[PDB]
Design an enzyme around this catalytic site. Structure first.
Site, PDB file in Angstrom:
ATOM      1  N   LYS A  37       0.728  -0.494   8.687  1.00 43.66           N
ATOM      2  CA  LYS A  37      -0.588  -1.159   8.948  1.00 43.66           C
ATOM      3  C   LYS A  37      -0.202  -0.473  10.061  1.00 43.66           C
ATOM      4  O   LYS A  37       0.487   0.341  11.024  1.00 43.66           O
ATOM      5  CB  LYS A  37       0.380  -2.700   9.588  1.00 43.66           C
ATOM      6  CG  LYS A  37       0.953  -3.087   8.273  1.00 43.66           C
ATOM      7  CD  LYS A  37       0.161  -3.737   7.558  1.00 43.66           C
ATOM      8  CE  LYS A  37       0.534  -4.817   6.315  1.00 43.66           C
ATOM      9  NZ  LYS A  37      -0.775  -5.873   5.836  1.00 43.66           N
ATOM     10  N   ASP A  43       0.775  -1.490  -0.211  1.00 43.66           N
ATOM     11  CA  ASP A  43       0.095  -0.101  -0.278  1.00 43.66           C
ATOM     12  C   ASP A  43       1.162   1.374   0.180  1.00 43.66           C
ATOM     13  O   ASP A  43       0.233   2.384  -0.397  1.00 43.66           O
ATOM     14  CB  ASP A  43      -0.866   0.229   1.031  1.00 43.66           C
ATOM     15  CG  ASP A  43      -0.160  -0.464   2.790  1.00 43.66           C
ATOM     16  OD1 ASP A  43      -0.089   1.327   2.750  1.00 43.66           O
ATOM     17  OD2 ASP A  43      -0.533  -1.308   3.104  1.00 43.66           O
ATOM     18  N   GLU A  56       4.842  -0.043   3.760  1.00 42.86           N
ATOM     19  CA  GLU A  56       3.684  -0.808   3.850  1.00 42.86           C
ATOM     20  C   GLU A  56       3.198   0.081   5.645  1.00 42.86           C
ATOM     21  O   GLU A  56       4.626   0.679   5.852  1.00 42.86           O
ATOM     22  CB  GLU A  56       3.922  -2.600   4.242  1.00 42.86           C
ATOM     23  CG  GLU A  56       2.865  -3.016   3.937  1.00 42.86           C
ATOM     24  CD  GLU A  56       2.044  -3.422   2.926  1.00 42.86           C
ATOM     25  OE1 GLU A  56       3.431  -4.103   2.210  1.00 42.86           O
ATOM     26  OE2 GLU A  56       0.870  -4.290   2.485  1.00 42.86           O
TER      27      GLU A  56
END
Lengths: 261, 261
Positions: free
Chosen positions: B97, B75, B95
């Site tokens: 999270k 992402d 990424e």
DNA sequence: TCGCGAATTCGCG
DNA sequence: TCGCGAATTCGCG
């Protein structure tokens, strides 16, 4: 089935033994075929152990811990052998994961989806969690030339063949094995570098690119390709195979223990 | 801030840019500091690519695919550089999270737990999914001597310091950073072999045990230690750092492109 | 269309 | 006690 292996597998079959309980049955089988060597079964390895093994390869590794009594529990447990130097060597680690209720739904009549209408359910990614334990045990074994980690997959998200299931209202719903709406099998194949699934990958490969050389640690990924339950007999046979393969690779460190005594 | 880097980071700050959008802002910065080199940004790598890179190291690797158009979407996206031989080299993957709603609950008054009574919620393991993409990109880069993968953690499950949050009814609830009821930070540390978090780990280490030698690919794990939101300025600075570090390690393959032209 | 991704709540010793 | 683990539904291009 070298002698007792046939007797053992049928015992597993007779009791529908889960993964941890089969790994125990393996420990007994192994110690019944190698009565001079010493085998043990654990259900846990705590991060401190891993870290200390990591530190012993290179002093800059293994210097992190945030929860002191943190651990990993492979639901199949670990089986080990004591080598010639009193050290404990891992001969088997195993895990068993389930994903994909689809075959159950369409074996009955329950329509899924936000509006209770779909026959199939869009598969999820929870199975990717399985990559952590693999890294932990791979780090734990970063000095070994074998990697006896075995994964056992079950469910409609790990099909290898096209299977058709008939719902109570006569209708045959059909699962296509290579549909990226159901199949999550690709989410796992990073774990053995795209080598074959349903295969014993226990001996580590050594590859390179330049003045390099590198060891690869590859998990043995086994799947029930028709969404059916695993047969605890074959599950036993596979685990017996990986662990005996492990003992082969350990051979040099085991000579005195089984030859002198 | 070498010139424009200060101007860029404040633009990120001014807009609260998410991880993918910062990775783009990095591509521009890089091409504004290296105007001879060619940079691109992707939001996807499909399994076929990975497999083909795997195959090129050893012909027995990369021979599995079950869903044909399967892919991975970090992402934060991927940023790459074209080297002297027309090949594309990965200079950044990132990424972001989030886990742990606790600070929100106890910043308000919502009691959690099965019986609506608990101040804290037992942390889950979903964050372990992050280990898959790491393996994919690590396999993708199994011929490189660098690993520009950066993870950005946020939430009450990745605290590095003890923080106290006061609920509307005056009560100060207290989060202990090393509580294995909240902290999941240990579930990630397999990814960099227990080396330091909040650190640039981009250059690959080479360790051994016997007649061995092995390359380690270690993710750079960055966390906001007080459960606060990440500041998109520093997020940018970190990513700029990893990617420039990547260009250092790529130097030999980039000489002609930025010196002859 | 298909296929990747979010992260969550709670159970268990 | 604390700490590890289950895998799920649905959203998004």
């Amino acid at each position: 089935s070298q002698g007792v292996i046939g007797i053992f597998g049928d015992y597993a079959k007779a009791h529908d033994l889960a993964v941890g309980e089969v790994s125990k049955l393996v420990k007994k089988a192994l110690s019944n075929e190698y009565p001079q060597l010493s085998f043990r079964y654990r259900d846990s390895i705590k991060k401190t152990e891993i870290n200390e093994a990591l530190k012993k390869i290179d002093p800059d590794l293994g210097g992190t811990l945030f929860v002191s009594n943190s651990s990993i529990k492979p639901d199949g447990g670990i089986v080990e052998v004591k080598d010639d130097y009193g050290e404990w060597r891992v001969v088997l680690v195993a895990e068993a994961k389930h994903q994909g209720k689809d075959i159950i739904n369409i074996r009955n009549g329950l329509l899924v989806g936000k509006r209770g209408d779909q026959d199939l359910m869009a598969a999820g990614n929870a199975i990717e969690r399985s990559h952590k334990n693999i890294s932990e045990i791979a780090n734990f074994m970063l000095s070994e030339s074998h990697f006896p980690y075995v994964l056992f997959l079950e469910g409609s998200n790990f099909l290898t063949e096209n299977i058709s299931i008939t719902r109570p209202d006569g209708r045959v719903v059909n699962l296509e094995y290579n549909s990226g709406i159901l199949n999550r099998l690709d989410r796992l194949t990073a774990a053995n570098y795209g080598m074959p699934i349903n295969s014993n990958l226990c001996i580590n490969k050594f590859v390179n690119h330049k003045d390099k050389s590198i060891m690869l640690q590859a998990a043995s990924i086994y799947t029930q390709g028709d969404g059916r339950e695993w047969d605890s007999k074959i599950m036993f046979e596979i685990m017996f195979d990986i662990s005996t393969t492990s003992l082969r690779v350990l051979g040099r460190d085991l000579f005195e223990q089984l030859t002198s005594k």
